[PDB]
Amino acid sequence: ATGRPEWIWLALGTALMGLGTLYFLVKGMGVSDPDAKKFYAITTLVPAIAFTMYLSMLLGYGLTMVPFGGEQNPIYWARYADWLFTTPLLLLDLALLVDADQGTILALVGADGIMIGTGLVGALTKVYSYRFVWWAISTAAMLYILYVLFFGFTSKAESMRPEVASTFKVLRNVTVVLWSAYPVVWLIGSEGAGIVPLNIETLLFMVLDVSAKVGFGLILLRSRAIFGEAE
Numbered sequence: 509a510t511g512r513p514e515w516i517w518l519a520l521g522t523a524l525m526g527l528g529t530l531y532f533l534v535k536g537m538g539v540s541d542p543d544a545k546k547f548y549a550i551t552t553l554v555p556a557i558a559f560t561m562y563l564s565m566l567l568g569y570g571l572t573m574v575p576f577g578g579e580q581n582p583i584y585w586a587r588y589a590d591w592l593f594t595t596p597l598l599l600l601d602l603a604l605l606v607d608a609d610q611g612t613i614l615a616l617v618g619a620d621g622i623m624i625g626t627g628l629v630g631a632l633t634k635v636y637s638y639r640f641v642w643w644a645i646s647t648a649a650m651l652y653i654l655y656v657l658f659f660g661f662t663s664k665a666e667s668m669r670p671e672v673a674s675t676f677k678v679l680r681n682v683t684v685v686l687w688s689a690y691p692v693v694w695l696i697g698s699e700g701a702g703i704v705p706l707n708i709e710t711l712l713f714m715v716l717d718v719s720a721k722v723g724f725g726l727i728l729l730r731s732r733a734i735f736g737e738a739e
């Protein structure tokens with residue numbers, strides 16, 4: 509409904525995830541290389557899931573009211589349903605690019621699950637001061653992920669094919685900068701201190717989400733690093 513001022517950004521987000529899904533879908537037709545097919549499958553699913561959850565927030569299904577600080581506070585819980593399934597897939601794109609081992613993949617996906625899950629608990633907590641305890645644990649799990657992407661993945665990438673290493677380093681830098689903004693927006697927005705209003709908070713997440721999913725995919729899927737070395 510248009511009674512919520514943030515609706516314009518939810519509608520724009522819905523449209524851009526939908527167009528991004530359609531573009532990757534058609535671009536992925538004809539790809540027969542089995543390696544490339546993995547990356548197209550992982551990367552096309554990411555905006556498709558986000559499309560459905562931006563639509564649920566636009567129509568009002570993905571919104572709940574949570575009492576804290578005396579007031580009833582609108583909390584879009586569908587963001588966490590979105591991020592639970594899309595953030596592991598983005599990490600898989602990076603780990604498959606560098607041929608990460610299985611133990612490291614499991615550690616990354618597990619820390620990511622702890623990240624989003626404790627962020628969800630913090631979003632729905634009724635005692636104000638406890639919301640920030642959960643924010644801190646979630647941020648600690650994120651810092652572990654960022655550490656592994658630098659001091660574990662970067663070291664191996666330098667020992668692989670040059671195009672793999674070069675594409676990895678670009679996507680790593682994009683991920684580190686964009687993921688690090690998310691905890692800041694939560695802390696000063698309606699889920700945390702309440703300094704920035706919800707309509708502006710929704711704009712900022714919309715720009716971060718499209719850049720981290722559609723922009724990330726455009727860089728990856730235009731690279732030759734996703735094809736096997738063939739003659």
Ligand SMILES: CCCCCCCC/C=C/CCCCCCCC(=O)OC[C@H](O)CO
Pocket residue numbers: 708712715
């Ligand atoms: C790829 C090309 C596209 C480039 C696009 C990049 C733009 C990102 C914008 C961000 C935040 C905008 C923040 C706007 C803040 C307005 C809030 C305000 O000023 O409200 C006044 C208030 O009533 C009294 O303080």
Ligand SMILES: CCCCCCCC/C=C\CCCCCCCC(=O)OC[C@H](O)CO
Pocket residue numbers: 525526527529530532533536539544545546548549550552553556559
């Ligand atoms: C206006 C359009 C709105 C947005 C569109 C609606 C999205 C939700 C619907 C469908 C899922 C469609 C398929 C998603 C799975 C794609 C996976 C893929 O492309 O895999 C390629 C691989 O190479 C194969 O082996």
Ligand SMILES: CCCCCCCC/C=C\CCCCCCCC(=O)OC[C@H](O)CO
Pocket residue numbers: 557560589593
């Ligand atoms: C490789 C793995 C691929 C993973 C593919 C999975 C994508 C699932 C997508 C979307 C719908 C999300 C639906 C979430 C359901 C929430 C419904 C609910 O619990 O509502 C409670 C209550 O009724 C109201 O507050």
Ligand SMILES: CCCCCCCC/C=C\CCCCCCCC(=O)OC[C@H](O)CO
Pocket residue numbers: 647688691692695701703
């Ligand atoms: C690498 C990724 C880093 C992610 C983790 C970085 C955490 C730092 C955040 C916040 C302290 C900001 C102030 C919190 C106190 C809010 C009360 C207040 O002073 O109001 C705000 C003021 O108006 C305007 O700064």
Ligand SMILES: *C\C=C(C)/C=C/C=C(C)/C=C/C1=C(C)CCCC1(C)C
Pocket residue numbers: 591594595623624626627628642643646647648650686687688690691694716717720721
């Ligand atoms: C879909 C796009 C991406 C990059 C999503 C990123 C989400 C996070 C980095 C979440 C961060 C949080 C932390 C670490 C602190 C509490 C709140 C969050 C769950 C938003």
